[PDB]
Amino acid sequence: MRECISIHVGQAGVQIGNACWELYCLEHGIQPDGQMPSDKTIGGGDDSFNTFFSETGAGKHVPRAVFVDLEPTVIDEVRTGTYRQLFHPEQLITGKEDAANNYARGHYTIGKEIIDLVLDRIRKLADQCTGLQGFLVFHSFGGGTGSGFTSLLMERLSVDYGKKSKLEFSIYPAPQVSTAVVEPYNSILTTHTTLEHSDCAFMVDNEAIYDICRRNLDIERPTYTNLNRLISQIVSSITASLRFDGALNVDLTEFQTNLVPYPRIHFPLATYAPVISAEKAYHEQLSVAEITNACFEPANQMVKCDPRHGKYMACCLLYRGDVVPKDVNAAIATIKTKRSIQFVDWCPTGFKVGINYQPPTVVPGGDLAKVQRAVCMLSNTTAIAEAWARLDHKFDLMYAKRAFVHWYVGEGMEEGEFSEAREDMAALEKDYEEVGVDSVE
Amino acid sequence: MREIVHIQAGQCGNQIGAKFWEVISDEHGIDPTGSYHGDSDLQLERINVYYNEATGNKYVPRAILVDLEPGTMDSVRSGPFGQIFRPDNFVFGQSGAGNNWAKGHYTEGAELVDSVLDVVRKESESCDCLQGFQLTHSLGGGTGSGMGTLLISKIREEYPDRIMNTFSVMPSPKVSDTVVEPYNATLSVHQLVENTDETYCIDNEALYDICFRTLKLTTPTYGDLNHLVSATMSGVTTCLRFPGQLNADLRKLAVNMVPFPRLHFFMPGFAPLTSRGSQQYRALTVPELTQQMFDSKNMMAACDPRHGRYLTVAAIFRGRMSMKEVDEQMLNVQNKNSSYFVEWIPNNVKTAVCDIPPRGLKMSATFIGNSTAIQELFKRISEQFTAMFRRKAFLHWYTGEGMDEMEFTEAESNMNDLVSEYQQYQD
Amino acid sequence: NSQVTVAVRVRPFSKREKTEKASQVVFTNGEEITVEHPDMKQVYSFIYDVSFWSFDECHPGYASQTTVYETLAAPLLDRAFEGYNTCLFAYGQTGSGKSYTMMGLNEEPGIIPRFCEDLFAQIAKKQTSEVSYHLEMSFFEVYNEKIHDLLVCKGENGQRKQPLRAREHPVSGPYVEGLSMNVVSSYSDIQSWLELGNKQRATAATGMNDKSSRSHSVFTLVMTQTKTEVVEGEEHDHRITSRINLVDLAGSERCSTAHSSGQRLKEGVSINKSLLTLGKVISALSEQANGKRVFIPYRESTLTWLLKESLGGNSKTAMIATVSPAASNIEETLSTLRYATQARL
Ligand SMILES: CC(=O)O[C@H]1C(=O)[C@@]2(C)[C@H]([C@H](OC(=O)c3ccccc3)[C@]3(O)C[C@H](OC(=O)[C@H](O)[C@@H](NC(=O)c4ccccc4)c4ccccc4)C(C)=C1C3(C)C)[C@]1(OC(C)=O)CO[C@@H]1C[C@@H]2O
Ligand SMILES: Nc1nc2c(ncn2[C@@H]2O[C@H](COP(=O)(O)OP(=O)(O)OP(=O)(O)O)[C@@H](O)[C@H]2O)c(=O)[nH]1
Ligand SMILES: Nc1nc2c(ncn2[C@@H]2O[C@H](COP(=O)(O)OP(=O)(O)O)[C@@H](O)[C@H]2O)c(=O)[nH]1
Ligand SMILES: [Mg+2]
């Protein structure tokens, strides 16, 4: 009745999906063979909730998702791995060639040949759904598939569907760390195309999760299997009101109404405060006040953006477990009491609240602990302009000499587009400077 | 699938390939009969990246051997790992080159290049999505320089959308293993830079220094030198064959390591290398490997990077290791050694990781670097070259075979212009 | 010393557009050229060393076809009489009236005919029984980084388009092997040659118009000064040579919007590569005029490699860019301005 199609573009999106569909399939009791051991015993119920998972008559539960990577190295781990009998074999393993970390390849060259199949699978599911609301598009700035292809997909989903939600979780580029040299070019050419079409685009930084893991969880040598699980917990808290039942249900249409004031500033941040290990899971009460004070605490945020260098515009707070609203009220009072946390002079409310009764589940072989309650904060700030400027300086430093451009023209990017796109990001860096101003009566 | 065609030309390329295949077969589990006797199953998933199939569950490689005298081809055949090569691909002729770049580019090379292309077309048309080509060739010599460059020129017209790599063995500073190193190497460079994507510039003095200092060997034969180049060649094409956390391939590195097209001359490097005794007193971690790689006593280019600013750097690691260690140690390298890096490129490094390492190591690493030091390899040649050409020393062996003095000054000016191009980003 | 003398020319509305009511988006204020959207949000403003505002006949600063010649070219011809090589460029998508600006009409000449006629007129005024002036020419093109000559005919077969190759002379400079060169004494001779060259040129439709241009085209004039001067034996003919060039470049062609596929994609790629390299060349030349020390990458494209000795050195370069003032064509008009702007700085 309330479905959401999950699109996973690239290696990042696919590994994150392997984490998400592990967590979800653990919650509802699904085994990787696609079956329920409970429904055969109790003889009823829909704990395998139909927001994410479909159902046929033989007693299986197939997910509502499709994978696409433009390379066969990743999806051939799923096909040949543990979750091979769950997914529909229509995963796009169009493994001719990668996008070469070139936005041009994944937007016109190898962006064709693959898209008119992707759209013919998103449409078989939407015709299989009755009350669809959303398109959760996991992708990654920097990569060619994750940037060109995701932008191309957004262009296709805004012409055929229209009045729907289209969201984005994305690995924003770390300021110091990087696995590529032309990350900024692809990022800037992405935000010029994923602006008018997307509704709310979340953002994270692997440097921030690295600093979280070695300071909260006591892990000195982490890896992506220890990060994508936290991202999966974010996505589960974001997408829990559609699965389980709680007092205050917050759907996906409620985010873009409360966190996106103007249509161009839809770039919030995310955080999740209890990241403590079993040893640290004790020695601590885990009350709503501690969590709600941790979610605003720097060094627990998931982007290297000191929010004390800027102001906030809105903050959604999605809670889970044994929470009483009185404590949330007290905590929000305590937060609005302080002065280090500046709010704008046109959003005194600045808060949305959402509660669910289900606790979060513990993935075996994982790093987190068992909690009676958990929290996720979406937060829009005027601080993130710092990173757009830090990303524009790099673009300018390289485009003055015009390096790494013959690879983009070689696949059909003229010359104006680098210049034209960078003039569209100055407007966004200027809007954030406008909203930070206090009005005059 | 992505697929490579491996051409190899001359006394260097044959002897290198005869060990590189003997290395890839160990990795993927093939024996001298062409049959599979492995233990795992990831060895067959991407065996089509190099090999082709046969009837009795055998595998035959995509090798194209193009010498101009059979004295070396008859050594691969009568060797350990020669009976697997397709006998219709032992291409050769007679009337050898005589270390004359003209004899292997105009007169006695054009009479055989069409026979090589008749094999290249067969071995390309039978491939779903070709990624590019390889080549192993020695500058200074004959066939490997001339016929190699001619094959590059004649491939770049038919398959320009694809990649062409050449693991060039460049000449060395101190000792000349051939008297006509400059006059051949200059004209090989003049034909490479216009018609290549990424060439790896190997030198032999560096490999001597490596095998003597690090590996602590007293009798380094060339079977031990090529044994390194093979590791590098494997490390480059690893994520194209095995899986990992963050994949990579040839074209991604070509985007990240070639800012402008002419500047695609790289220094390679492999880690970890140690003596058969001194392996008991070293730790296997990412920072140790990084220390060994960014040191100058491992780079095979015979040129010190400390004389130059790095323009762009790549790293390909193989093993179950952490990503934070890589993303931290590389940032540390850029921070402490900033003067050895450029400023108008903010991040001069990239990474790639595979989760299937080499047969005997818990983890490995591989290094590629574009540097402004490599000008010294050509600044020397243009010094060696013109001192000969100022008074036409050996030139009569080249005008005799259909050339002219203009074709020398062309390359002499091109190389100098490239030296200027690199020197622009030195101060 | 090296200069670039960027300029822009805005055409007036055509009868087609005055009937169809095409809007106006580009405006002027002296040296400012502003571009205002129909209703979008904002405006960009561009500065150039020279500007030509041919929108309205009654505005001040109306740049007619005569003032275009008396402000850009004539310095090149009064500099070529000194002994220096010159290069004039041209850039603009189809419809902006490049042809109206360079060649022109029978009653509204462009730059080419006024240039050649002022030349031939200065010859006879500047000619004696000892001094002379011999003029040979050429007309060639670039197609996917392959040189081609246009004066010679092609046979009725699949193709007679022989790809001549470029070479480097050690003293004079780069050149082409097999370039036909013909002689001129009256502009009718050059007209009879271009009326064949532009017929033999590459041109095709992609998605917007049936008559376009998909190949750079160079028109070179070699000029000589065989003067006899010595009072010992009436010999020692001290001769000076000059190379004038008037190239007509092509469109930049965002490919996606056209969905290019096949023998159009390659062409767009190669054209845009040549544009990118020429941009670096002009920018670094203007930066070299200010006393810096930098590298001009002529070798990354055939066109620059065949003009190493005409742009650099003690030579003069010039560029005029054409753009339409309509609102229908505004993504292809902003590009031109940004291109020529970076060519200026
Ligand atoms: C007890 C033990 O650890 O044996 C090691 C060993 O002693 C060392 C020194 C090996 C040894 O290699 C050498 O000593 C060597 C060095 C230069 C030239 C020729 C030989 C080794 O022979 C080489 C071999 O290298 C490998 O890891 C792969 O087996 C190697 N395969 C081949 O090269 C090969 C060649 C012919 C036939 C079959 C396989 C390889 C390396 C990279 C990529 C692909 C394959 C290994 C682990 C060892 C020995 C065997 C002692 C080292 O090898 C490499 C390539 O890293 C040399 O330094 C490393 C460190 C290892 O500790
Ligand atoms: N959080 C997280 N980020 C990842 C993961 N894998 C890759 N990334 C990010 O992805 C970025 C690079 O883009 P790619 O991973 O190559 O995305 P892609 O779609 O495969 O792009 P191409 O390789 O060009 O096809 C890196 O900077 C990583 O930070 C992952 O498993 N988890
Ligand atoms: N590394 C290595 N280099 C070699 C080998 N054999 C020859 N060379 C080098 O190749 C050069 C000689 O060229 P050569 O191969 O004989 O010319 P060709 O036969 O026409 O290709 C010299 O610089 C040698 O150092 C070898 O087995 N290993
Ligand atoms: Mg990828």
Author numbering:
A (entry chain A): 1 to 441
B (entry chain B): 1 to 427
C (entry chain K): 391 to 735
Give sentences from the paper.
KIF14 belongs to the kinesin-3 family of motor proteins. As all kinesins, KIF14 possesses a highly conserved catalytic motor or head domain that contains nucleotide and microtubule binding sites, and where ATP hydrolysis is coupled to the generation of mechanical work.
Construct K743 includes 8 neck-linker residues. To investigate this issue, we obtained the cryo-EM structures of microtubules in complex with the constructs K735 and K743 that have truncated neck-linkers. We surmised that an absent or truncated neck-linker would mimic the situation when the neck-linker is mechanically pulled out from the docked configuration as it may occur under force or in a two-heads microtubule-bound intermediate. All the KIF14 microtubule-bound structures in the ADP or Apo states are very similar with the motor domain adjusting to the open conformation. Consistent with the structural results, we found that the K735 and K743 constructs have reduced microtubule-stimulated ATPase activity relative to the longer KIF14 constructs.
